[PDB]
């Protein structure tokens with residue numbers, strides 16, 4: 014436990030100094046003798062004696078951020094939050110604290126490369142929601158607002174916080190907008206192989222699937238612990254980009270398209286010991302997210318093969334690097350399609366450059382910036398981006414976005 | 428307690444027990460991960476360290492507690508007493524060197540670890556001897572292009588003022604020169620080291636691919652220059668299977684990668700000079716040596732000849748040019764029958780190696796950050812492979828550059 018930590022950029026020899034790690038909260042899984050850095054995931058709802066210090070920690074942080082630490086209002090808030098916990102075992106966040114918390118959960122998210130945008134986030138309070146129909150209303154407004162006819166804007170919608178654990182609000186979808194995957198009796202998969210499991214859940218709950226290549230899944234929404242309910246998102250609200258290529262005329266004939274709004278809805282927002290199990294947030298895409306992961310991953314659309322077939326690449330020996338050539342072209346198509354349809358999207362070069370600039374600024378005037386190299390480095394051409402050569406410290410700050418069990422694995426059906 | 432690692436693309440789960448055996452620290456704490464940080468003895472310390480190594484040696488050849496084991500322990504204890512150190516048997520030395528490669532978390536090429544030719548050079552006393560051992564190493568390892576893995580182990584550190592050191596970072600590297608205007612002729616990574624040779628009276632050909640002389644230090648004395656006989660340096664001209672102009676870039680690289688500035692550590696003994704060599708994974712040359720900004724940096728030039736539009740980043744022009752360069756490199760080596768491996772085959776081998784190690788050994792330390800190839804990452808099997816990283820010994824360690832310590836004489 015020393016007070017300073019340094020990180021070097023081995024390409025630009027710049028050294029930064031981390032003090033912020035001292036405010037780190039929970040353990041990382043790593044120890045003195047092992048490193049879990051590449052491990053993906055290394056109803057105990059809080060009690061009073063647990064919540065007091067967590068609440069106090071966050072409120073102190075909030076008033077520090079707005080330069081009123083030790084003020085009258087600061088002490089009064091503490092007194093109010095502490096009385097509220099003593100007699101309700103919980104407390105509610107003011108709209109300002111809630112908005113602060115959201116933004117800082119994003120800011121604190123070590124695996125996100127797009128954090129340079131963090132302060133610019135539209136927060137939708139939906140803590141007054143009581144039903145699935147209402148959730149759906151809020152989600153539709155979130156999507157229209159975030160999509161903005163292609164000029165995408167980051168936004169989060171926050172539903173009521175957990176209480177006893179039996180009355181949780183959840184979005185069962187992993188993203189608000191995903192394509193269905195249908196397992197076939199002959200062993201193949203139609204649509205998106207990633208979402209096969211969730212598709213069967215939807216179908217079992219009553220969904221009539223069109224059984225197509227690009228079927229937008231419905232929302233599965235749980236309010237206040239009740240069984241979840243199905244809702245079809247209005248097709249006009251889902252912006253989609255058909256994928257084509259600046260040079261390859263045949264690329265359009267592959268028949269691919271993708272949606273514009275990446276909207277993650279299964280994560281959990283934790284602020285001052287409060288747990289918002291349902292907190293969907295959206296931004297715009299990095300190209301490699303659709304181009305490399307969504308399409309080329311073996312257990313995804315796997316058009317790697319077919320593209321290489323249409324490029325007439327030698328696909329008999331790997332050392333021809335037919336896969337790499339193919340992947341690059343696919344990512345060129347994705348970026349070209351989104352840009353043509355003036356839908357917001359960022360390439361992996363521009364984004365990693367942005368994040369380095371963000372990291373430097375965070376170190377300069379916040380004392381550090383937690384980052385996960387393993388996730389920050391893009392899935393293609395890593396070494397020729399600035400982040401590859403950049404040393405990073407990884408630690409967990411609160412407020413944070415966390416993972417949570419899939420709701421179907423925990424839900425007590427009514 | 429036991430730990431799992433999932434491959435997410437195949438859902439295969441391995442259980443790690445081996446990590447419980449380590450005692451060297453990683454640089455991480457419970458609260459901070461430093462997995463992307465590149466670099467995070469007397470009688471009294473030396474016996475338990477030796478005892479640890481001797482034990483896992485006699486456990487390795489299934490004679491733990493044998494007459495020999497008991498005696499060998501006694502022999503080593505008596506020697507640390509009366510000399511404040513000890514000497515490794517031949518067998519132990521070869522076992523120890525293979526196992527330092529086996530324990531190399533950042534090495535993707537470890538499937539080959541038991542195939543290692545070990546050259547004992549612990550009788551060496553001068554730079555001239557060192558030179559002789561090194562030339563022999565290069566001749567054997569290069570093997571006319573059918574490369575073979577070797578290590579040459581010079582005497583162990585004693586008091587510290589008598590270290591053996593190969594000052595070159597690799598046995599075969601290219602000189603880099605600081606130009607008058609500001610740019611750099613040749614390999615920029617080595618510009619400091621090139622000036623150290625020029626200082627020693629090396630006459631620089633001042634060209635793009637000049638092979639650097641050896642700088643060798645024995646028993647702590649002043650390092651000395653030696654030219655490597657050119658017939659021993661296997662080189663490859665880089666050209667492209669479709670593009671006719673690629674050879675007009677005048678590029679070429681050496682066949683033998685031989686890292687010579689690390690420190691082998693066995694049973695508490697330190698070998699400050701122990702050059703080891705293997706063969707290349709194509710991205711080491713084509714992605715890092717040629718395309719890094721702090722290196723040969725020829726992407727712009729290539730993509731220019733490929734007539735791509737380079738005005739915006741989102742055309743992925745750096746990306747295209749990069750692939751084409753690595754195709755060339757692989758084509759060039761394979762055409763000259765010089766052992767090389769593509770990052771796809773190398774990663775496949777390593778997943779298989781990992782599974783082997785989890786079977787027969789209970790684990791396999793691995794640094795994901797270094798194992799994942801510096802291009803086309805998520806289309807190699809190792810991207811979706813979870814990996815535990817821990818510090819096993821014997822190991823190869825980093826050491827300071829010798830010109831930062833050595834008081835000249």
Ligand code: HEM
Nearest residue numbers: 119122124125126127130167169294295296297298299414
């Ligand atoms: C605005 C543009 C954004 C871009 C370009 C971006 C980019 C990315 C990328 C590429 C990843 C890696 C995930 C993957 O590989 O699938 C990621 C992760 C993540 N992002 Fe961002 N993101 C953006 C906005 C946001 C926003 C608005 C939030 C929340 C308010 C957010 C929170 C997160 C979290 C929590 C993760 C993963 C961390 C974890 O799994 O623990 N991101 N982002």
Ligand code: HEM
Nearest residue numbers: 528531532533534535536539576703704705706707708823
């Ligand atoms: C046989 C073919 C081999 C291949 C294809 C190979 C490949 C690689 C690659 C690509 C790296 C990453 C280094 C970088 O990119 O900067 C690496 C690291 C390394 N390799 Fe290998 N290698 C081979 C043989 C060997 C041998 C013979 C030894 C020693 C006996 C060895 C020991 C190491 C060590 C010590 C590292 C750095 C590990 C660390 O810092 O923990 N490798 N190797």
Ligand SMILES: Cc1cc(N)nc2cc(-c3cccc(CCN)c3)ccc12
Nearest residue numbers: 127275276277294295296297298299302
């Ligand atoms: C808001 C936002 C934008 C974006 N472009 N990518 C995200 C990616 C994620 C994300 C986080 C963890 C895991 C995943 C995908 C699972 N392999 C995505 C979350 C939010 C994102």
Ligand SMILES: Cc1cc(N)nc2cc(-c3cccc(CCN)c3)ccc12
Nearest residue numbers: 536684685686703704705706707708711
């Ligand atoms: C034996 C061998 C073969 C090979 N193809 N690459 C190596 C690469 C290394 C290595 C280790 C640390 C650092 C470096 C270069 C700086 N990234 C190389 C060591 C040995 C290697």
Ligand SMILES: C[C@H](O)[C@H](O)[C@H]1CNc2nc(N)[nH]c(=O)c2N1
Nearest residue numbers: 051052053387388810811812813
């Ligand atoms: C095994 C590994 O930790 C895991 O698959 C991670 C690696 N790095 C990643 N990086 C990004 N951006 N996205 C990912 O899904 C992953 N997967």
Ligand SMILES: C[C@H](O)[C@H](O)[C@H]1CNc2nc(N)[nH]c(=O)c2N1
Nearest residue numbers: 401402403404463464465796797
């Ligand atoms: C900062 C970062 O850890 C450093 O540049 C590492 C990252 N991973 C690497 N991986 C390999 N194989 N080779 C490298 O040189 C590096 N560089």
Ligand SMILES: [Zn+2]
Nearest residue numbers: 043048455460
């Ligand atoms: Zn770690």
